């Protein structure tokens, strides 16, 4: 009805200076955006370092395979048993091309499945990719990209020098089978003349390779299998070495951690999707104001406290963990000096921030101690992994849990030598961790100075149970009341103003990452009062069918109750009985309901309606 909607055109251009850093300076120069960008860049470089370090062995094996073929009819090929998640391994293939171009041992063409709908297009993109690849190391029209031109172009340059011709097929299962078989036969026909190596991107198993390759195609194939690591193993490596690393001041809550790991383990093995979900959690945390720019290292946090305005103090006063801290103050002038003076709180904030950072440093060390103590036990009640005890220790009080009582009982059944060996393992692991990871980080001297006398006291109790059944209970009591009670509290029993550092809000991030369109459509077609907040459209029960409803919900409630086939006449009479122009409103409801896919018109039948959602 508008000038923007046209009856002829479908796309509209609003070009403003287009030729052949989106936001303004008002938010980029704010401190919360700078600290968010810095924290995200650190975490992204750490995850990229971990993924490259995980891939480097199989990368070296593939480069040795291609170079060993260059040192030397069937074509040599390399099936790479990669994971389910296809978007993750394009970086692996990019690193493989970079290592093959670094030694100048070969030149690589990457054949996506979208470019190879026919044999003609597959050969054309193959020759064009190799020609443009060697052009880009140091242009033909695609209809002139033939194998004879590839032979002449190879004879012109590299026959006087032997550069292999690596052909990546990253999505092996998405290729057409006949086009792939003809392509393998073509590449096998040109062996001797043109050196072809065919690395693959097989995702499911080797049975797919052995099934899609027939008798005659596989006889010209000399494949060698490599194995990339599993996606849960890479997830556990990232979760232990990034999201639990003490150097980062932004911690997730147990519910958010369990939500993201539930998304990974239950729905999709995409660690890229986990990365983007953690990025959305980081963005939703840091965009609460300039108060949340304090979530960093200590000295920059003190500069940030000295930078703070008054609204940010009002957002550190509104958080629910501040109210029991104000409530426990006995002095009456002190609450006056905290709540309205706004400079005494500015003097107070370094102590609270130091206590919070020290609490999470002690939490990480004590968590490592208790994971090595508990997870070596049989039946694993609190879990073996560090992340499970992280979730359980942050969610609720660990001591009151019955599973902790089960751990105490099954740890009390042990003999002397195995028990002393296990606690000595926990001692040496925590000492090694305090040496290697807490020491170079700032405010790590205070964490080691706090935690080390309790470790020495537990080691003295271990010597006492060595020199002397009953003393195992004293060792367990020293372990509890020196490590588990003090440094493994829940999130509710945290220090004051710990929110600036944890991210507890899971409802908004859950509805914004996980998308549920059918839930929103079902809730807007069952009770419209939930969205509109009418004073008259409220339903005490969801099938009441009140008469003041919106025009679509009456139609939805009249056809949800009926059978699969929907007659138009009796339902038109029912909609007339609930609430001329009424025929136009009914037909408009037909158009709105058919637009969403809840029904489809029975064109095949005598102009009736047919429901699709049951």
């Amino acid at each position: 009805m508008d000038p923007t909607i046209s009856v002829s055109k479908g796309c509209f251009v609003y070009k403003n200076g287009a030729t052949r850093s989106l936001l303004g300076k008002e938010v980029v120069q704010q401190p919360f955006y700078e600290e968010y960008r810095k924290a995200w860049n650190q975490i992204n470089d750490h995850i990229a370092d971990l993924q490259h370090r995980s891939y480097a062995r199989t990368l070296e094996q593939l480069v040795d395979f291609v170079v060993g073929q260059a040192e030397r009819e069937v074509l040599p090929t390399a099936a790479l048993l990669t994971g389910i998640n296809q978007p993750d391994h394009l970086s692996q293939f990019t690193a493989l091309t970079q290592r093959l171009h670094a030694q100048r041992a070969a030149m690589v063409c990457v054949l996506q499945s979208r470019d190879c709908a026919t044999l003609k297009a597959a050969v054309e993109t193959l020759v064009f990719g190799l020609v443009e690849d060697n052009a880009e190391v140091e242009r033909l029209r695609r209809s002139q990209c033939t194998m004879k031109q590839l032979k002449s172009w190879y004879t012109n340059n590299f026959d006087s020098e032997r550069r292999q011709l690596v052909v990546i097929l990253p999505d092996f299962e998405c290729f057409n089978a006949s086009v792939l078989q003809d392509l393998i036969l073509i590449l096998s026909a040109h062996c001797g003349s043109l050196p072809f190596v065919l690395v693959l991107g097989v995702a499911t198993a080797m049975t797919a390779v052995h099934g899609t390759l027939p008798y005659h195609v596989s006889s010209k194939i000399r494949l060698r299998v490599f194995q990339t690591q599993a996606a849960p193993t890479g997830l556990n490596e990232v979760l232990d070495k990034v999201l639990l690393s003490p150097k980062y001041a932004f911690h997730l809550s147990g519910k958010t951690f369990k939500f993201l790991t539930h998304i990974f383990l239950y729905y999709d093995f995409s660690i890229h999707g986990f990365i983007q979900g953690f990025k959305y959690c980081l963005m939703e945390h840091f965009f609460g104001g300039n108060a949340f720019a304090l979530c960093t290292d200590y000295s920059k946090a003190l500069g940030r406290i000295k930078q703070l305005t008054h609204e940010d103090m009002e957002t550190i006063r509104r958080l629910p963990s501040f109210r029991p801290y104000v409530e426990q103050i006995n002095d009456c002038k002190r609450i006056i000096a905290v709540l309205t003076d706004d400079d005494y709180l500015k003097k107070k904030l370094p102590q609270l921030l130091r206590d919070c950072l020290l609490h999470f440093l002690l939490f990480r060390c004590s968590l490592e101690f208790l994971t090595e103590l508990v997870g070596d036990l049989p039946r694993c009640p609190l879990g073996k992994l560090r992340r499970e005890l992280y979730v359980n220790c942050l969610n609720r009080a660990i001591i009151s849990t019955p599973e902790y009582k089960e751990c105490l009982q099954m740890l009390s059944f042990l003999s002397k030598d195995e028990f002393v060996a296990k606690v000595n393992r926990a001692l040496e692991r925590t000492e090694q961790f305090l040496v290697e990871e807490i020491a170079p980080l700032e405010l790590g001297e205070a964490c080691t100075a706090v935690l080390r006398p309790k470790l020495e006291a537990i080691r003295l109790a271990v010597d006492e149970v060595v020199k002397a059944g009953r003393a195992l209970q004293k060792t367990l009591q020293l372990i509890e009341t020196q490590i588990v009670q003090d440094h493994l509290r829940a999130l509710q029993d945290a220090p004051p103003i710990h929110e600036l550092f944890v991210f507890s809000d899971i409802a908004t991030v859950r509805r914004n990452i996980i998308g549920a369109p059918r839930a929103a459509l079902h809730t807007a077609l069952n009770n419209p009062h939930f969205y509109m907040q009418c004073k008259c459209c409220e339903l005490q029960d969801q099938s009441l069918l009140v008469g003041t409803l919106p025009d679509l919900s009456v139609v939805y409630k009249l056809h949800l109750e009926c059978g699969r086939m929907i007659n138009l006449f009796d339902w038109l009479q029912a909609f007339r009985s609930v609430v001329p122009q009424i025929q136009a409103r009914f037909t408009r409801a037909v158009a709105e309901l058919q637009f969403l896919g809840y029904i489809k018109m029975s064109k095949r039948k005598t102009d009736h309606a047919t429901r699709l959602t049951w």
Binding site: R318, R323, C332, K333, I335, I336, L339, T340
Partner: peptide, 17 residues
């Protein structure tokens, strides 16, 4: 309760203390 009435009750109790 709201932050405003909580802070106001705390300040009124501190002034009455």
């Amino acid at each position: 309760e709201d932050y405003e009435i909580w802070k106001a009750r705390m300040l009124a109790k501190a002034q009455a203390k």
